[PDB]
Design an enzyme around this catalytic site. Sequence first.
Site, short mmCIF file in Angstrom:
data_model
loop_
_atom_site.label_atom_id
_atom_site.label_comp_id
_atom_site.label_asym_id
_atom_site.label_seq_id
_atom_site.Cartn_x
_atom_site.Cartn_y
_atom_site.Cartn_z
CG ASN A 97 -70.73 -44.22 -42.89
OD1 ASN A 97 -71.07 -44.03 -41.85
ND2 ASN A 97 -69.50 -44.37 -43.25
CG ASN B 175 -72.87 -45.37 -38.30
OD1 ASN B 175 -73.93 -45.97 -38.44
ND2 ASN B 175 -72.51 -44.89 -39.36
#
Length: 129
Positions: A46, A59
């Site tokens: 990301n 994540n």
Amino acid sequence: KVFGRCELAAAMKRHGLDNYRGYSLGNWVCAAKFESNFNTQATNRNTDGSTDYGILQINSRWWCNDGRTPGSRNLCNIPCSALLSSDITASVNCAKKIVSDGNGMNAWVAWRNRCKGTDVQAWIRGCRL
Ligand SMILES: [Cl-]
Ligand SMILES: [Cl-]
Ligand SMILES: [Cl-]
Ligand SMILES: [Cl-]
Ligand SMILES: [Cl-]
Ligand code: NA
């Protein structure tokens, strides 16, 4: 490992995901399809420098440690690499923590945009469960 649709459904069911926090099995299979295309080895970086890992693209900013996300938390208490295993247990256990934290499955952007409000049961149709 790249799972088959019904193969993953059965694995998720066995690990207690069906109707977990009110989300039927079809939701979880739909989310895994669009997050990782059923591939346990999927990774994606990301913009903030964090990385998403595994079949449910968990994540590194919050949930696992990958040794390269400064000032991140490790709330599932696991190395992110553990999320890439052909055994989905770690991914599943961590997902249960994520979905319990207040925002439900809205934490998965692909679920919100591509599964939420659709006929998610279609994802487990035809499977022997
Ligand atoms: Cl369902
Ligand atoms: Cl690096
Ligand atoms: Cl880190
Ligand atoms: Cl498994
Ligand atoms: Cl909810
Ligand atoms: Na982290």
